[PDB]
Structures are given as structure tokens and as C-alpha cells.
Design a binder for this molecule. Sequence first.
Ligand code: 18J
Ligand code: 18J
Lengths: 116, 116, 115, 115
Amino acid sequence: CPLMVKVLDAVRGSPAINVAVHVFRKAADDTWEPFASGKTSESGELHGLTTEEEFVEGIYKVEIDTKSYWKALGISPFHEHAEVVFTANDSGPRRYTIAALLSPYSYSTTAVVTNP
Amino acid sequence: CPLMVKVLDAVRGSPAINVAVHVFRKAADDTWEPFASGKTSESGELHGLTTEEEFVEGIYKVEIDTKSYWKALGISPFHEHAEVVFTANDSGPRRYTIAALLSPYSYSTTAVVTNP
Amino acid sequence: CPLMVKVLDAVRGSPAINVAVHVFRKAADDTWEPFASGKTSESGELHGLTTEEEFVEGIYKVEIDTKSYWKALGISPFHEHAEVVFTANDSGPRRYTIAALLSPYSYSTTAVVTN
Amino acid sequence: CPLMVKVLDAVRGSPAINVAVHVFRKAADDTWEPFASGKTSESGELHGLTTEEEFVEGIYKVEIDTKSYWKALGISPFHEHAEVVFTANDSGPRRYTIAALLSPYSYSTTAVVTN
Ligand SMILES: CCS(=O)(=O)Nc1ccc(/C=C/c2cc(C)c(O)c(C)c2)cc1
Ligand SMILES: CCS(=O)(=O)Nc1ccc(/C=C/c2cc(C)c(O)c(C)c2)cc1
């Protein structure tokens, strides 16, 4: 459980369910390598992306597929995705929750980082 | 558990702990009557404010004491509090989570409303 | 002009036009007394609320009538209004912009305080 | 000018001054090609990025160098950068303002698209 993603919908006042999320990690040659992916649950949460063994230090990009979410609801949104790019585990393993709050022309994101 | 408040700190990347929260309900004479109060836990959550019997229809104000929070951390913030004012339980009982994300000169708030 | 209010709409990607805004000043008995008010322009702005002479230190509340805004657009909203409560302090910079970004079940607000 | 970027600082309550901003356009092979760049002004704004003739429909990415911004202020930041990815569409309004509100572990962004 070192990486969890939580997504909320600011139009509905609800969890954002069935949101696709893709995680990438920067490789030594500066390309973005696929790392993990999944879908938010009925609570708007996505657990089980990685393990503490797999989730090594690096630069990670969490791409939340907001356009796909809004289009499935019949809405034409502004953004293609919401991206969150950060260095992880640089002073040892941490647990990361990446949260996003979505509207059709806006989003907010925050991180909660805890030390187990 | 029909009303829960969750507070996050956007400077630290952490739950906002020990945040005082006061809830008021508009009375028939248009004054704000004290309704419930409490403090966020180490997870940034405040549970147990009210009961489904007590939490009747009305207009409620959730005042999150952000200035007091920032001052206890040695920071001089802009706002006195963050306030969230809404009509509750007008089409029957609902469960409400009021969330706030705090910075010294800014805040965001959202509501998650679910039907049990 | 020491106080400006800016309102944006996160659903339509636009300024929030013709939004009623009321400013109150906290009185000695802790009641809120009306101070200034108006409606946002086509750019989502409300200028001319007060003057340097009038805008003394104290606690002010800016109430933005978001419920009426959303209903006039045909959208069901959560909040009754958004309110921003702050202290004006002469030791800090002299122009205050209160900005708000509105969604039906959420809002964001920030202060930009400059000289 | 069809594209403007506005950056605000939620810790200091100010414009985010001298922030590097890079705009990229998605190429046919899905790579990001540099399109425009600059540094925000004293008002937190970056004007003059492109012209109507240059700013054709397509997918664009605006990368805001928030990590450098925070470090120059002595504050420890979470993100490497903030990036805003969107499609320019000629069927919608013609001026795009991309606004971002920065905190060390969070950011908010909105689009204001007007004629
Ligand atoms: C208790 C720790 S947890 O990880 O399990 N809970 C938790 C984590 C993240 C958030 C983010 C909330 C939130 C709320 C609003 C209004 C926002 O604009 C944004 C950007 C975020 C909330 C709770
Ligand atoms: C009037 C058009 S303009 O472009 O010249 N002015 C303008 C443009 C964008 C903004 C964005 C504001 C803002 C405020 C808050 C609190 C936010 O969270 C975010 C994400 C954005 C404000 C004013």
C-alpha cells in the first residue's frame, strides 16, 4: 500500500468511479516507462498499484484519465488528463496518497506523504 | 456518522491534525445556533459530531478554525476560518463528508454526499 | 481601490458573470455590518467596492451568492453561498484581491495581497 | 494573443513571479515538441507566448517549473513541475487563459476560455 490514488467529482459531490489511472517511472534514458495502472472503485479509490519491493526511488508520473471519465458521463471537458509528477522514496520508503478533485474545466490535486 | 469533516495540509503534505471545527444550524429566527463541535484526529478526520436523530433538515454552517491551526504551527495565515454553508437532509437523510485542503493564503473545500 | 473580488466558473471555464457579492465588516458586538456590495462584471470582477479611506483594519467577510448563480445556469448546487473571512492588516501589502473558483459541490479561494 | 498563463502562490498570497513555463505541442508521432516558453512577470503572468496564426488546433502541454520556484524561496516542494494538458478547439472561444494556484504539496488549475 505505498501508493494510493483517490478521485472526487466536484460536480456530483461524489467519488469519481471507474477513473483510469496510469503510473509511469522515468528510466535512465529519460523516457517514461509504464509502471502500474488501474481503475478507481466505487469509493473513488485505487489500491494495489504496486508493492514496497517494486516501488523504488525514482521520478513517477501519475496520469489520471479525466477526459475519458467526463466523456463516459456525456460531458466534453477541457483537460486531456491530470498529471502528478514527483520524486518518490528518496529518503527511504514512504506511503503516498495522491488525491484529485475534478471539474470539467479545472482540477485540484494534493499529496499526503506518511512515513511508516 | 451522517457528518464527517476531513482536513488536509497542502504545505506539509499531511493530515491537518488538531483542527477545531464548530457546526451551527440556522434557527427559525435566522440566528446561527451552536450544533456540534470537535477537533480533527491524527488522520485529519472528525467523526462523531452528530447522530441521525439530531441531524435534522436545516441550513448548517461548518466553520473550520484554520487561523488557530496555522498560528499553533507558528504561521500567520490570511483567513480567520473556512466556512461551509449548506442545506442538509432536505430530501431525506444523507451522509455528508466535508473536506478542506489548507494553505496559508488559500483553501479548497468539497462535499461528498451519499445516500445510505 | 484596495479590495477586488474575482470569480471564476470551473464547469463552464469562464468568468462567473453577474454573481452577487456582499462584503461585511465585523462590529464591536461581533455582529456583521454591511460594508459594500455589487455584482461581478463580464470579466468576473467586482471593482470599486471601497476606498482606501473606508477600508480600515478589521475583520471582513465576503459572501458570494453561488446558489443563485448556479440556479440561473440551470445547475443544482450544494452550498448556500461561499464566504471568505479575513483580517485586513496595515502591516501587509495594500491591495487585496479575493479570488474564488466555483464548482457545484466545491470551491477554492485565494488571496493575492500586493503593493 | 490566444494563450496566457497566470500563476499564483497560495503560501505567500502573491503572484508567482519568475516561474519558468514551457509549452509543448503534441506531434504526429505522439512526442512533445517545444512550442513556446517564458518566465512569469511581476504580476504572475506570461503573455506573448504565441500568435493566432501559430496556435492551431491540437493537444498542448503547459509545464510550470514549480520545483525551481519553491527552491528559490527556500521551501521544500513535492512536485517536479505542474503540467496542464488540453486540446485547443476552434469550435470553442478563442482566448485561453491557463491559471495555476501553487502550494508546496498541492496545486489547482483552471481554464478560462472566452471570446
Ligand atoms: C486520511 C488520509 S487519506 O489519504 O486516507 N484521506 C485523504 C487523502 C486525500 C484527500 C484529499 C482531499 C481533497 C479535498 C479537496 C476539496 C481537494 O480540492 C483536494 C485536491 C483534495 C482527502 C483525504
Ligand atoms: C479575468 C480573466 S484573467 O485571466 O485575466 N483573470 C484571471 C484568470 C484566471 C484566474 C484564476 C484564478 C484562480 C483562483 C483560484 C483560487 C484557483 O484555485 C485557481 C485554480 C484559479 C483568475 C483571474
